[PDB]
Design an enzyme around this catalytic site. Structure first.
Site, short mmCIF file in Angstrom:
data_model
loop_
_atom_site.label_atom_id
_atom_site.label_comp_id
_atom_site.label_asym_id
_atom_site.label_seq_id
_atom_site.Cartn_x
_atom_site.Cartn_y
_atom_site.Cartn_z
N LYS A 195 42.46 46.90 31.21
CA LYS A 195 42.35 45.44 31.41
C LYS A 195 43.76 44.87 31.51
CE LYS A 195 39.71 41.42 29.89
NZ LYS A 195 39.01 41.44 31.20
N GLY A 196 44.04 44.09 32.56
CA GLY A 196 45.30 43.33 32.73
C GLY A 196 45.02 41.84 32.86
N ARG A 197 45.99 41.08 33.39
CA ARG A 197 45.86 39.63 33.68
C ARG A 197 44.82 39.46 34.80
NH1 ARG A 197 51.18 40.54 34.37
NH2 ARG A 197 52.71 40.01 32.77
N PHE A 198 44.81 40.39 35.75
CA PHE A 198 44.18 40.19 37.08
C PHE A 198 42.91 41.00 37.24
CE2 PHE A 198 48.83 39.36 37.90
CZ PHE A 198 48.70 38.01 37.72
N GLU B 25 40.21 44.66 35.86
CA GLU B 25 39.78 45.78 34.99
C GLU B 25 39.86 47.08 35.81
OE1 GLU B 25 35.97 44.58 33.36
OE2 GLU B 25 36.91 43.07 32.06
N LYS C 30 39.97 49.68 40.48
CA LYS C 30 40.57 48.44 39.94
C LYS C 30 39.77 47.28 40.52
CE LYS C 30 45.04 46.55 38.75
NZ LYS C 30 46.50 46.74 38.86
N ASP D 279 57.29 44.04 37.44
CA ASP D 279 56.61 44.23 36.15
C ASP D 279 56.65 45.70 35.72
OD1 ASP D 279 55.31 43.12 33.90
OD2 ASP D 279 53.35 43.42 34.82
#
EC number: 2.7.11.30
Length: 290
Positions: free
Chosen positions: A13-16, A18, A32, A134
């Site tokens: 799980k990120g900002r944008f 799963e 993704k 990043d």
């Protein structure tokens, strides 16, 4: 033309998005999944993964992107190679690594970044550089052969001459270069230098968990002993900029000649002055001299 996938397990799980381990009918793939609201990040990554000139052993292998209508609306899929050994942060948390592991991980990391940064293909032809923006251990994947590949291009910037002044400090505060924390950037080479600063911190994470030094501490993220779990930019600026703080290199680490060389390379790469940092290319060259 939708691939026969079944979502087994949430691995990310990120900002944008799963990320799911799934099956294609290679049986093991990564999926993704971006909601409609994160279309922009899906597209930014899709364009990098679809670029003929960013195919590289040290960049995550892309199969396809898909649009998948759901009951709630629509999802945006990137389907990639799956690296069972997981991201570098999870891997360094679990394992103490050998000198040979460090040399393969570090070299592969620098060759992946240098490839992104290069204004030219191998066969000499020009290409627009990408900066990751990043870079961090959770955005690096460990392949079975213990080389890295880069992923998570959602915040990446094509170094386009038409990029406006408005086109801040996007990314993970913990890994942000002093000049980013200071809002003291313009160079073109300026964004490449920020990637290299973050790369330095990751080389440090690798070195911190290498048994060549002798006694290895539990894994902690860079600045873990000084800032909270989810540090804000202010706290990071106080450490990295105001106090010139960097992750600790205990002198006993330098007693191994390999570790000494890696510690000298990465230390140059996290210099306050972006112009003092080595290029990713230069770091990859030093790693081959090991």
């Amino acid at each position: 033309e939708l691939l026969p996938i079944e979502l087994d397990t949430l691995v990310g799980k990120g900002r944008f998005a799963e990320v799911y381990k799934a099956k294609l009918k290679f049986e093991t793939v990564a999926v993704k999944i971006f909601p409609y609201e994160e279309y922009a990040s899906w597209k930014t990554e899709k364009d990098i993964f679809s670029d003929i000139n960013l195919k590289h052993e040290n960049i995550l292998q892309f199969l396809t992107a898909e649009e998948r209508k759901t009951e709630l609306g629509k999802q945006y899929w990137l389907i990639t190679a799956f690296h069972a050994k997981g991201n570098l942060q999870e891997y360094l948390t679990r394992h103490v690594i050998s000198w040979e592991d460090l040399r393969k991980l570090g070299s592969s990391l620098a060759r992946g970044i240098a490839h992104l940064h290069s204004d030219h293909t191998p066969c000499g032809r020009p290409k627009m550089p990408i900066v990751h923006r990043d870079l961090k251990s959770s955005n690096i994947l460990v392949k079975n052969d213990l080389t890295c590949c880069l992923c998570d291009f959602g915040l990446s910037l094509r170094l386009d001459p038409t990029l406006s002044v408005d086109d801040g400090q996007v990314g993970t505060a913990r890994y942000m270069a002093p000049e980013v924390l200071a809002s003291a950037m313009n160079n073109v080479e300026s964004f490449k230098q920020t990637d290299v600063y973050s790369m330095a911190l990751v080389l440090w994470e690798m070195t911190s968990r290498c048994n060549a030094v002798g006694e290895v501490k539990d894994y902690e993220p860079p600045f873990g002993s000084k800032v909270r779990e989810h540090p804000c930019v202010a706290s990071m600026a106080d450490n990295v900029l105001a106090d010139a703080g960097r992750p600790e290199i205990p002198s006993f680490w330098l007693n191994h000649q390999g570790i000494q060389m890696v510690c000298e390379t990465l230390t140059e790469c996290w210099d306050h002055d972006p112009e003092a940092r080595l290029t990713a290319q230069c770091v990859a060259e030093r790693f081959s001299e090991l």
